[PDB]
Predict the structure of YOPE regulator.
Amino acid sequence: YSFEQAITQLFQQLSLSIPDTIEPVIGVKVGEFACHITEHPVGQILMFTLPSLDNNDEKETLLSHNIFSQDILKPILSWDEVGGHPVLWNRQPLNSLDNNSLYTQLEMLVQGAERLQTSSL
Amino acid sequence: YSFEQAITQLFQQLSLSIPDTIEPVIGVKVGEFACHITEHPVGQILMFTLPSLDNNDEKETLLSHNIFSQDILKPILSWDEVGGHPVLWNRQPLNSLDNNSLYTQLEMLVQGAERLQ
């Protein structure tokens, strides 16, 4: 199961037109979240977005978002030390995907991005 | 591999006595790190340890340990809000394990705990 085929199916389930040329890093906008999909490392489908973090959130609160859960697609909050900004991402094997695999991954990623903006109050 | 079979092979490699009855959560002490191994969710082998972080590390420094890399066994640093302590963990599918898969996962987890310094 290649990246090309994976993206195709995903775009077919998003009511999106199958791109004639599938770039290495694909961008899909879900609401206000620009999500990027790519193969990294080879054999793994990685999805990531750049969230907005409340400057008033402590490290403990941010790290609490990364505790393991029963959903292996729950995204991880990290820092692009170099880029100087947060990176939220998830990941799964390209060889064990199901019809709804990629959609759920993208959905769990956005859901995680929304939770991060739900914390100030 | 069933959870029991994976644990048995790992313990043989670590030369550790295998309990008569294998519990769902299994611990192993490596150096100064107590590591816990369990199947969660079903079909996934989860390992985690409770590290001691450097109080000098800022928010950005701690979260930088979580960026994705080429090694899918690189551990994730998180926090248990109730216990009030950090939790470092990694995970991989039970259905795609090899002879040294769990040993490598444990090695990567401890290596990560050491990098937190």
